[PDB]
Write a structure and sequence with these properties.
Layout (H helix, E strand, L loop, with lengths): L4 E3 L8 H4 L1 H11 L7 E4 L1 H8 L4 H11 L5 H17 L4 H21 L10 E7 L5 E5 L2 H13 L4 H9 L2 H6 L3 E7 L5 E6 L10 E8 L3 H4 L6 E6 L4 E6 L5 E5 L6 E5 L2 H4 L6 H18 L3 E9 L5 E10 L1 H6 L1
Helix pairs in contact: 4-5, 5-7, 5-8, 6-7
Enzyme class: transferase
Cofactor: Mg(2+)
Function: Catalyzes the phosphorylation of pyruvate to phosphoenolpyruvate.
């Protein structure tokens, strides 16, 4: 059937009926040639056919429609019971196996691409996706945890707040507002990571690109636990105009078992070397231009770079927002 998961490369914008907003979002981006972490959507029908396999639907509705919406003890109660069922009832085999298979596919493809161990335990993020509250689990490892966290996502539909808000609506609306999708995406396993601005934070010059980069996970650069290398390009060209290479003393990497990060020392030989090649700056610079023309304002981008087993450098776009000062001023 194939009804329950869809790879990101195949999700379009016009798939909002089946994957929701966040996921059709990520779909248009890949489509616009913006390289977001690879993964798949768990489609709205995974949750839908779950609640329809037994009386589960009637009972959750009953619970939501039952509540004293001005009593907190009423919301707690309904929340508790609702969640127990959402994590508890049997998941239909067709749903479970497809989610399992989609994850194994991602893990094997990735282990091939990264040229790392094919151990079916690739770390992923799992994040909820309303059809029109964000739940996020990071560093999820193995098919069992993916299934477990996908269910947690479905359960977050039944917070005190979320219940109270649907308890109001017409049955139609609550049914439509109970639809959910789930995104399963690679955690980065960055060789180099960092941030990029398509405007100078300092001057508000919108004709330059600033990249701050360090070894391993972007966390060391985002949290200021390392002194990054700094590069400046002009957009016209693009032309590299300036670099400043630091002693990069620490990095974060994935934990071996994939469940967290670990802080460690960058060994001598790598500390004072430039962590981005001239071709990689140009890759990054080009993605910044794409990303900024897509959104239509200057960006503050968080990126990662992986070197694939064959050798090609692959840039991942992890997050992106308007650059704050440009925005503050405006």
């Amino acid at each position: 059937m194939g009804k329950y998961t869809k790879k990101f490369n195949e999700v379009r914008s016009t798939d909002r009926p089946l994957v929701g907003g966040k996921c059709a979002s990520l779909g248009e981006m890949v489509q616009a040639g913006l390289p977001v972490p690879d993964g798949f959507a768990v489609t709205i029908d995974a949750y839908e056919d779950f609640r329809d396999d037994s009386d589960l639907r009637a009972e959750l509705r009953s619970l939501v429609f039952g509540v004293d919406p001005d009593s907190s003890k009423s919301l707690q109660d309904a929340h508790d019971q609702a969640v127990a069922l959402v994590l508890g009832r049997n998941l239909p085999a067709a749903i479970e196996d497809e989610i399992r298979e989609a994850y194994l596919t991602l893990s094997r493809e990735t282990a091939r691409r990264r040229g790392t161990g094919d151990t079916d335990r690739i770390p992923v993020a799992v994040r909820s996706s309303s059809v029109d509250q964000q739940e996020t689990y990071l560093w999820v490892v193995g098919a069992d945890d993916v299934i477990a966290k996908v269910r947690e996502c479905w359960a977050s539909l039944y917070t005190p707040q979320a219940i109270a808000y649907r308890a109001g609506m017409s049955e139609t609306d609550a049914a439509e507002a109970s639809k959910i999708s789930v995104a399963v995406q690679l955690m980065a396993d960055a060789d180099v990571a960092g941030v990029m601005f398509t405007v100078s934070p300092r001057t508000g010059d919108r004709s330059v690109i600033a990249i701050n980069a360090s070894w391993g996970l972007g966390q060391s650069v985002v949290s200021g636990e390392v002194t990054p290398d700094e590069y400046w390009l002009s957009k016209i060209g693009p032309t590299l105009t300036s670099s400043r290479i630091a002693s990069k003393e620490h990095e974060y990497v994935p934990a071996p078992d994939g469940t967290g990060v670990i802080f460690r020392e960058v060994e001598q030989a790598r500390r004072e070397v430039s962590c981005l090649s001239d071709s990689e700056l140009m890759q990054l610079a080009e993605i910044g231009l794409r990303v900024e023309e897509h959104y239509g304002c200057p960006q503050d981008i968080e990126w990662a770079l992986e070197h694939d087993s064959d050798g090609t450098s692959r840039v991942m776009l992890l997050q992106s927002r308007p650059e704050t000062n440009w925005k503050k001023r405006k």
